[PDB]
Design a protein around this nucleic acid. Structure first.
Length: 79
DNA sequence: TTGGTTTTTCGTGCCATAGGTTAATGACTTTACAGAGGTTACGTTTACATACATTTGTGAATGTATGTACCATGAACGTACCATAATAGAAAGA
């Protein structure tokens, strides 16, 4: 029920990170994986909304996806 | 008067006495082959000192490793020229 009601937050934050690094369906899938990893470690006693906490995780997912291959060769993340 | 048998010399042919170059095996002698004996300058075997390598620990380069807590809620997010005709498909009236 969480993922079927928050796929659209993922696509809304994922359609602004499509700067021609790779085809964007992999970015949609990695955003869904980041949504899963943000739901798996979500707290209730904080009192804040879930989007601000999930934004950092989904940007980390999109960052590691765009820095995973990024070329035909392998370049590390720090480089 | 002329042809032919008979007979005797005479240079030529056969036999015998003399005397010399030159074949014989050898005895040569000279060259060649076969016998040992002292000396040379290597070739193989052996020990010993020092060297490039190769085998170890120790100080620096990167690299995945998990997370960051006001609010972020659907779209292509700029692609593209529009040739030509054999063979089927999903329906529409015959």
């Amino acid at each position: 029920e969480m993922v079927e009601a928050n796929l659209r937050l993922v696509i809304s934050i994922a359609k602004k990170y499509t700067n021609r690094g790779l085809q964007f369906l992999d970015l949609i899938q990695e955003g869904n994986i980041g949504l899963m990893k943000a739901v798996d470690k979500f707290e209730y006693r904080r009192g804040y909304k879930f989007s601000t906490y999930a934004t950092w995780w989904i940007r980390q997912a999109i960052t590691r996806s765009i820095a995973d291959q990024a070329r035909t060769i392998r370049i590390p993340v720090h480089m």
